[PDB]
Design a protein around this ligand. Structure first.
Ligand code: NAD
Ligand code: NAD
Ligand code: NAD
Ligand code: NAD
Ligand code: ZN
Ligand code: ZN
Ligand code: ZN
Ligand code: ZN
Ligand code: ZN
Ligand code: ZN
Ligand code: ZN
Ligand code: ZN
Lengths: 347, 347, 347, 347
């Protein structure tokens, strides 16, 4: 069958206590799939949802997590092109209204009535989770769900971000936070897109990981006292594009100073209460764009999962049990997560 | 002939005393035209060069002014396609190196070795001024030089800025400072480009001018206490594009908040020591680009002067004498300049 | 109620006999609206569907017409954001699969499983017609349905085509067939988009109409023996963009020769068995793009209907009865349709 | 010194007799470099110039060749940033007017007064050749001139062509003629740009070369009777982009049929008297662009030579003597040139 009770990590108040307990199995709405979430990536956005670091409020009590890879155990009556047993991906964008100007254009993420897994919708830190069938990701059969789970928010995000920077092949892309969860996949997406990857990160295991996944230049922010000058030399004038997948505001500000003239600084990371204080003179006389970038749409999901399918991207994951989700968060705020963490909801 | 002495407004120290006295007539270099500057637009950048409001240093003693419209009285030996008597325009970009990556691409303004009239090169607040012949603007014969002078920095700038905002016809463009020197021409360029122009300015004669030149919605910043909300209503979700041609940093910051999702806030105005402190969360979840924009290139100059030629743009100018240049600056810092001021170098 | 029988123009074989008789009222599927089609534009595509001029086969017996403007008299159970009494527009794209790569990207028209009103789906030459609710056009209340009907295929088409030509404001756009049904709206969309409109058409009432709707240069193909030379002079080097809304193949070929270097020739008209024989040398040494363009998507529909709402476009329509649909087709093959014809389904 | 006589291959009438004899050494004009052409690539455009296969006429008597890599032995007085001994590249675009709208925009190749090496200017099939210093390619020191010579017309061309197809990383690019001189470099540029390369060529040594340089799918046009169907399967719907670097018109036409919906067929090859007869219906209902592409500009030259510098592209060259240039042409019309031929002007 589909059971009545399931295991999930749920918190009832912000920065309170994540309880791995038994919660009721959700019922899929007319348009939603019920997905047996096998593995789920643990994004930093989940730490932000728990701490309430962001302006928007979350749907308490909340089962976070928005990188779920699972099998469709049930569907709604109005779900059309989906089978039971198919591989589905719960992304951050649970669904959207698919009618507003933004949605029609393609910008489904920047939509007023966009449902958000792991914030406004009980996400994928649970064995069974519902997801709007139009926005759920189609994961090909015979795919390692643990390996594809981080591609559902980190992969599509950094793919849309690297497309957001208006880079060309051969252009320098500085990925700020290049050994984190999103940065370690941005390095691989950018190399597969043709760019020269510069990496800025620091800590135990960060430079080694960055060199592992194919990065070109690594600049350790805990050792480099002049980061802007270091990325004004490595790059020969600045990085034609910058991807801020850090959780630091000082990194977001330095990225505006080591970007090339006519370059694009994409803001992807969303630290708590951070502002991108950009010098107006330097941004104008260099014609620097500062582009915010939200999670990708269905087209970006298809393209990022296709990059994953060809074996070009491979997020460095450690699969732990869902029981361990408290200890991941306390390991994620301390910057000690090298690559991605994926939780076995079973365990 | 070409005389030995000429009249020019020259200052020897920043925010010192602008002296309208007799200075030697320059000699055109091998690549430069000597232009009998008949009329010259007075930009706010000239007030910034005098006050030294900007990071870069100016070439003291300096004859400012970078909107000169004049006749070519002499040329250099290596100048090719130019006649004596032709109408030339001294723009902010006096010249460029025309060899570096940026110059080759087309971004001649963001070039390391770009010569700048009215900053690093004795500009057009003088009867005779030299200008690199490759970057000088070709003004058609039978043109009102007084009327075309403001198009040489304000016009090409706001044209490149409106092209920088990635707007489409019918999209809302909020021009911040829409009755100033650059804003009053941005309103006209945007309407001729097809956009719905919202205007934000305030003071005596600003709303009336804005309504004169064809603006749609005017929002008076000295009366409107909620500017962001007012431009979130007029526009129905925010302005698809914003052009910051203000000299205020609070305007630059509010423009990041009343821009539409997936909209572009172009920074054109460069107030003294201003920073574009942008909320990272709001910029990311709305995918807002913040694009700096410098003066246009030769293509943008050609296209903006073609817009002027068809009679579509007409900067509201008051032609005073060059003798009056001190009194313009003290009228420009006080925000009391409605439209543009143009100086008769003769007078 | 909703009646059992209705009046419609139906043909049972290609180029057979259009019978205005009583046909059963359709039943809306789970996703479809039943639209009381008040007025319907008569496109040339309907003449092509009747003659079978196109490669694809039509769904016999067929009730053509794909420019229906009507009120929603009934809906399906899975239709979400729609009211009874709302104004809906049956476009050529009746619906789409909204799942394939093209649909996800935004290209809903170039979709393998795209349902097509007036070809593969009983269209809008009938009092009551069904239309997929996701693709039906939202026509604002208090709109002249007769006046908005031609905007449902001609308007969105020529809007997407003018966006397809990668034109800028001030650039020359040669609309081939500028007094026809699509050309007369392309002239107005292009002028509202900022372009200089050149018009090529010929016959009684074509030049007068073209001058009426705001065209700049008219070149009469029945009087001009050198059309390419005439549009190499008017334009000063060729038209930066060309829109082929003709039903002639010689026009489609000449458009490749009077387009500017680096210009774009958009093919919109689809004459019977026509080929765009383009000289490869001239297309390469001038870097001329030849872009085919299909009907617009939901975003283009929204933007074109917004242009119509502001009063910027106004298709020259003559509203006749649906009874007269045979006599329109025989007037449309002879090129004698100046502007658009709209049929009162009531009459 | 610089000698008075030199060795060059010169023909006095079209398809006449190429004579390797002693011709006078040219004198550099005020803006031109005299380049000791060490090695020169032999393009098919040189065979077209000899046969007079193209509409434009050549400058008889003509020393063809437009892929010269050499050292600057002398300069003109108005040449600015150049040294004697530097490595210069004579490309097809010898120079341009650098003042017309196209040149200002960046499209220096599609310019009315563009000087063309190997057609309108004695090219690089000679020991000493002059080249406009603004358009000459800057080849880094310590570069294999024989290996960089084919990058001067083939490399920059196929780079600009792959940028012309509006492809994204992961998209399918079908290179028609993928083992020829331009195709063998288009395969490498496309793989370094991130695309999946499909190759269409045939003959001895073509499939082996294509597999050597990193191609994914090879489709042999002499064995495949259904080329369109084969490239509608390999690609799963058609190639998102096609690069026609063939010398066949049937290939140019089939490329319009095996391109994906919303795909771009770039015409690069310019066979004799060829026309791109494109079905208008299929091009419109699939929104297929057919983009002609001429040699790249200075920015594309810089970017293609940078790709070469990183070791990412490596044209398969055979360096023969200049004495052998007749036997290359008779080997190039027969399609028997696998990769590129480079002539030692010394030999
Ligand atoms: N905008 C979007 O679409 C989107 C999507 C996913 C995540 N995010 C946001 O991205 C942020 C990062 O997510 P993650 O999963 O990569 O987090 P993570 O904690 O796994 O990785 C962050 C990385 O940043 C590095 N870093 C810290 N300070 C730095 C500095 N000063 N300079 C450079 N690098 C520095 C850390 O050492 C670590 O390597 C979070 O705020 C998350 O919410 C945004
Ligand atoms: N980036 C470029 O290429 C470029 C080119 C030219 C000028 N500029 C810069 O643009 C700035 C403005 O130049 P200008 O000639 O338009 O100056 P101006 O003084 O003539 O006009 C400025 C306008 O801004 C209005 N304004 C002031 N505070 C405002 C606020 N809070 N909100 C909205 N509007 C406000 C003023 O009332 C006035 O109408 C200067 O700093 C100048 O150096 C930049
Ligand atoms: N691709 C699309 O999305 C799309 C959409 C709608 C219509 N169409 C096609 O567009 C074509 C035209 O449709 P319409 O409604 O405008 O037709 P129409 O018959 O109302 O107008 C055609 C116009 O072309 C003019 N014309 C004829 N020969 C010409 C020539 N040699 N040069 C210039 N002009 C010439 C006619 O005189 C007339 O003015 C049809 O084939 C139709 O199917 C395509
Ligand atoms: N537009 C430009 O900027 C530009 C630049 C350089 C060359 N060109 C033109 O490109 C053409 C090719 O130049 P090249 O140096 O590559 O020539 P080449 O002769 O060295 O190579 C041509 C290749 O096409 C292959 N081919 C032949 N028939 C084919 C078919 N039916 N289908 C697929 N492949 C086929 C041949 O076997 C060979 O592999 C010439 O006409 C040249 O003038 C254009
Ligand atoms: Zn996430
Ligand atoms: Zn929405
Ligand atoms: Zn200025
Ligand atoms: Zn430069
Ligand atoms: Zn139609
Ligand atoms: Zn589809
Ligand atoms: Zn060549
Ligand atoms: Zn030129």
């Amino acid at each position: 069958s589909i059971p009545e009770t399931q295991k999930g990590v749920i918190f009832y108040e912000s920065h309170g206590k994540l309880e791995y307990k038994d919660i009721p199995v959700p019922k899929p709405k007319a348009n939603e799939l019920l997905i047996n979430v096998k593995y789920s990536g643990v994004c930093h956005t989940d730490l932000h949802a728990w701490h309430g670091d962001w302006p928007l409020p979350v749907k308490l009590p909340l089962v976070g997590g928005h990188e779920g890879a699972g099998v469709v155990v049930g569907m709604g009556e109005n779900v059309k092109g989906w089978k039971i047993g198919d591989y589905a991906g719960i992304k951050w964008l649970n669904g959207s209204c698919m009618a507003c100007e933004y949605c029609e254009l393609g910008n489904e993420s920047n939509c007023p009535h966009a449902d958000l897994s792991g914030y406004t919708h009980d996400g994928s830190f649970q064995q069974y989770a519902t997801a709007d069938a139009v926005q759920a990701a189609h994961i090909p059969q015979g795919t390692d769900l643990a390996q594809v789970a981080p591609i559902l928010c980190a992969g599509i995000t950094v793919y849309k971000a690297l497309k957001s920077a208006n880079l060309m092949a051969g252009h320098w892309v500085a990925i700020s936070g290049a050994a984190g969860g999103l940065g370690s996949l941005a390095v691989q997406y950018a190399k597969a897109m043709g760019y020269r990857v510069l990496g800025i990160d620091g800590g135990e295991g960060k430079e080694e990981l960055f060199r592992s996944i194919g990065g070109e230049v690594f600049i350790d922010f805990t050792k480099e006292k002049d980061i802007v000058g270091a990325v004004l030399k490595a790059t020969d004038g600045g990085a034609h594009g910058v991807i801020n997948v850090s959780v630091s505001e000082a990194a977001i500000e330095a990225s505006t100073r080591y970007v090339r003239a006519n370059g694009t600084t994409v803001l992807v990371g969303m630290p708590a209460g951070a502002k991108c204080c950009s010098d107006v003179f330097n941004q104008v006389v260099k014609s620097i764009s500062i582009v915010g970038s939200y999670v990708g749409n269905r087209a970006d999901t298809r393209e990022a999962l296709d990059f994953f399918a060809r074996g070009l991207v491979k997020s460095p994951i450690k699969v732990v049990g869902l029981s361990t989700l408290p200890e991941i968060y306390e390991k994620m705020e301390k910057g000690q997560i090298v690559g991605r963490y994926v939780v076995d909801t079973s365990k």
